[PDB]
């Protein structure tokens, strides 16, 4: 039951590379692609993310995409850079200049068919392809513009497969350019229509976790990405190891998405411990559970108490009491029942995996479909309008053939998305 | 109180005790449903591909 | 002798199937390779155990069973398991991708693709029968395959085998082990479509089995393995009359005759005792009176409900082990004076009793202790309707908002089928109430 | 923190219980349909018992016993006593009664009605249902029931009631009884005499003001309401003093022994049918037993109410008592006002 991974642009390829480093370590795959683990539990579902090559090697089913070669050269020379299939590096030279239009309509349009050819080659080697996962940012040009172009094309050629994305939302707190709200709004417009599941990873949240909780005065993008790759490992554990719950992309979607447009998830991770003496402290299941539901552990800068949970997936990792996990999960729901919509009975599902992540004896990853996510889109909308009011910086886009109407339409649909969340928050 | 129908064999026995007395779709129709559903899926996909074509 | 074909649909159906056939083999002295030393008629026969087992010229005893799942990994464990020699490959049918906990996906989309193949493989077994009775169908309510494909299969079996009886063993959903939020949808959808095609259905609430395992087997967090071995014991108790010599419930028609006076109201409550931990160091063996009295305790039922606040239409007591009628009748006499047992006015107040002198067989190394006597009570009580009420309530909460409905419409199901199914359930709840109050 | 839901808005007793629970700061009221509750203060009709006790991680408790209605309906009570050997047809403390339907014990009632009149003894009867007619003529009683078009009971009218002085007044005793989840039977030490303000008149079996002691009826048709005591409610301290001064006995001896006997007998009879001892959810319930006392100081049971209000004077104490023994007993927080009714005679 194969998944095809795609990583687009600078952010996409950098978190993507980190993701493959992390899960390769978990599955016992070294940078050469050789298995050197001591558990058949590691290889039982390794087919989901890896192709088996000659010499008994394991090759990520991963396609690396960018409109400039820079970041992908750094991936190639990175720790696990050698593991990737060289034919799956698809790149241009021009770059996208943080311009959604360039990624979606001009520069990316020239490269997209090359990417689709590689996607097709990978899909053809699948016994039964379940779908796709894309890693990208929404604030740039390539990951945002070309990434959503790719998603549209893939849906056309594979309309009955699941589309999943890890989408990094822009924040003024951690920003490269002022046009990020434009690029993001244009992208959300695409994601609302053409994905089944989207993990909303807010750079604002990643920074605040690094600053407040982890006590890092000056976080780099690399430190932000450690949080993302750890979270990505967690949310895909059910796909990568034997289990009952959300074991594939479609079953997850059926459990998490009560209405097709409302498929934007808040991910969370625990423990998040600052360095010092307490880093060695043993964590209990009650502490894990409380922290995983804590807003300060969420990867989307939204207050869960400002909305209601439609659905929740929780996944615990490591050796621990299944009985204790069940008891604590029930405690959360029963002690905070008003925050879980009563018109979706039993909307919290829990999985437990024996294999813990590197450097932790136990951890917990949170996936919430909360109406509080509307705060995220409201933020982008306000930032969008502040500029669009005066048509500021629009010439970068109109120069690539876009019209103002397309901005108006993107904004309206994102505002519709927000009001749809508010509807069910009040229901 | 009233025991009736006592039957015995090498493997066991059975009886009844009464305490007190008292006072389809055709094959074609099935085929029709399955094909009508397939047509609705087919229509949905066509509308999507048209939307993507635009 | 008249044959019975067992059909196991989806993960729950298949895994419960595994437990049942393992137990059957142990009960009949059939080895994992299918050899049965005690069977002196080599290569054939019309003994009672031949109802469930055919014979090959080489003396292999093969289950009259078909396993079907829309995804291969569960049935693959059967293919490479300890009883892999027992089954012929054609008996084990698998698809490529499953119904994704979606009734519509299992019934319409994937069901259409594979139904004819399944009926062909069932036909192969039926051709080996001189006098096929009908079918025993094992499935979950909550799964996409268990719910969706089963109801399609049941419809077609009524077409292709119109005179044959069809019995269900159905797993009712419980949040403590469930894998999908939409299982109430799937349960009501499959119940609606299957209702007219099922003659008698034994519903098992995973909640009840889960709590019995915690309470009486001291298992902190029961697994499907724990649940299924207990379920298999109950199923075996129910099917024992078809597989051994006797005069009660000897064919499938008799199940309907004895337990189901009203066709729509065909869901008998099963209650089993005693359930004893194999790790219990000191156990005082329970009497006929004690195990029989336990049949009227909700904590021992396969569905948690209260038969005191409903009415009985029929009641069978199925004993295994050291039991004689005299002790059964004495037990019933005292229980009737202490407990609330009320039959409908148009049925006699009484009990059909079956005894098999062989005590329950337990899986070596299992959770259950060997006991000297055990009983399974099958009672058709209106109180089981409590289960429909719970299910219909959860259905209403979600459907009022049309939560998750797009998943079903996306597979080609009309939204109207939701309300049609729900209306059928409302009628069923009304039927139960009319009879029971 | 424990959680509870309120599903009967018209209940004065449990509105007060709700107020008291919230005031502890250790209880939280959820929305009406939130299933994740510890306590359900349920509706009077079609309470969904079938949905209780199916929430993992929650001990669930409800303020009604499923099946208790057999005791708390007019016609059901008659049948229960008549058909239960615990109580039996020869029950000494229940007036001779018959279940009668419109157009059944009609023919059996008339057989009894005759030799009643053909034996130089009183023959007044009362017809009712859960619209009341007191009459000396059988045909008047049977005619009235059919004209009403409802299931009815015809009961022997107590012609020789105990009459309070001054006034020559009729009365009935209300006892409040709390049955907890362990089926402990608690009698509230405070009862109330709901009195008539009009002199009892055997000549005219109308003037319901002197024959029917309902708290509402006295308020409307009685000119002397509130005359002898406030709200036509005499409590046990005064009534006990009266019995001592006037009849040289006590409330405990002459009346309460019988009342406790009747209560225990009724509830122990239905215990097998309604007990939640080994159930997946638990029940408690508050009952209101109504009693008549004749001039020989013999106590008669009249009805059992499954959803009683309380006397204004006694709401605070009783409701707090309910929280203590019925609720906090199951859900402990972070001298007793009840008499526990138990008796184990060996024979
Ligand atoms: C940035 C620096 C903050 C990164 C560092 C290491 O790779 C990261 C280790 C990680 C640290 O977590 C802390 C400080 O609490 C931190 O990563 C963060 C804060 O995001 C480090 C030093 C460790 C120690 C992890 C082991 C264990 O899981 C605990 C913690 O990670 C978590 C989940 O909190 C590691 O050992 C990590 O190696 C660098 C090199 C950094 O200097 O630049 C990077 O790219 C980095 C993140 O890899
Ligand atoms: N008792 C018991 N219940 C099971 C078992 N396996 C699954 N279930 C229950 O069945 C329901 C899910 O249905 P499944 O049978 O797993 O799904 P399926 O029939 O394979 O259908 P799809 O996977 O959606 O195609 C849940 O309520 C589970 O708790 C089992 O082995 N024993
Ligand atoms: N057999 C009888 N003999 C004498 N008086 C009787 C009687 N039955 C009833 N009564 C009188 O009629 C009054 C009302 O009877 P009943 O008990 O039906 O009313 P009710 O149902 O409203 C009491 P509650 O408000 O407590 O339910 C009683 O209080 C008593 O005064
Ligand atoms: N977390 C994270 N965010 C990044 C990284 N690089 C860029 N971003 C964010 O992504 C946006 C810029 O998009 P980028 O990927 O650089 O442009 P692209 O190459 O055209 O797709 C901004 O919102 C940045 O904050 C990274 O390494 N990590
Ligand atoms: Ca033979
Ligand atoms: Mg950049
Ligand atoms: Mg399955």
Numbering used by the authors:
A (entry chain B): 2 to 42, 45 to 360, 369 to 438
B (entry chain E): 6 to 28, 44 to 74
C (entry chain A): 1 to 437
D (entry chain F): 1 to 103, 126 to 152, 159 to 362, 372 to 384
Reported in the publication:
Microtubules are dynamic structures consisting of αβ-tubulin heterodimers that assemble into protofilaments in a head-to-tail fashion, and the straight and parallel protofilaments interact laterally to form the microtubule hollow cylinder. Tubulin heterodimers contain two GTP-binding sites, termed N-site (non-exchangeable) and E-site (exchangeable). GTP bound at the E-site makes tubulin dimer more prone to polymerization, while tubulin dimer with GDP bound at the E-site tends to depolymerize. The taccalonolides, a newly identified class of MSAs isolated from plants of the genus Tacca, have a distinct structure and microtubule-stabilizing manner compared to other microtubule stabilizers, and, most importantly, have shown the ability to circumvent taxane resistance.
To determine the exact residue on β-tubulin to which AJ binds covalently, we used crystals of a protein complex composed of two αβ-tubulin heterodimers, the stathmin-like protein RB3 and tubulin tyrosine ligase (T2R–TTL)1215, and solved the tubulin-bound AJ structure at 2.05 Å resolution. The taccalonolide AJ bound within the taxane site, which is located at the microtubule lumen. Most importantly, using its C22–C23 epoxide group, AJ covalently bound to the carboxyl group of βD226 side chain, consistent with the reported mass spectrometry data. In the tubulin–AJ structure reported here, the covalently bound AJ pushes the M-loop outward to form an open conformation. Another conformational change of the β-tubulin M-loop is that it forms a short helix, similar to that in the tubulin–Zampa and tubulin–EpoA complex structures. First, AJ was bound to both β-tubulin subunits in the T2R–TTL complex, while Zampa or EpoA only occupied one binding site. Second, a GTP molecule instead of GDP was found in the E-site of one β-subunit. In the T2R–TTL complex, the middle β-subunit (chain B) is in a situation mimicking the β-tubulin within a curved protofilament, thus hydrolysis of GTP at this site is significantly accelerated and likely has happened before we add AJ into the crystals.
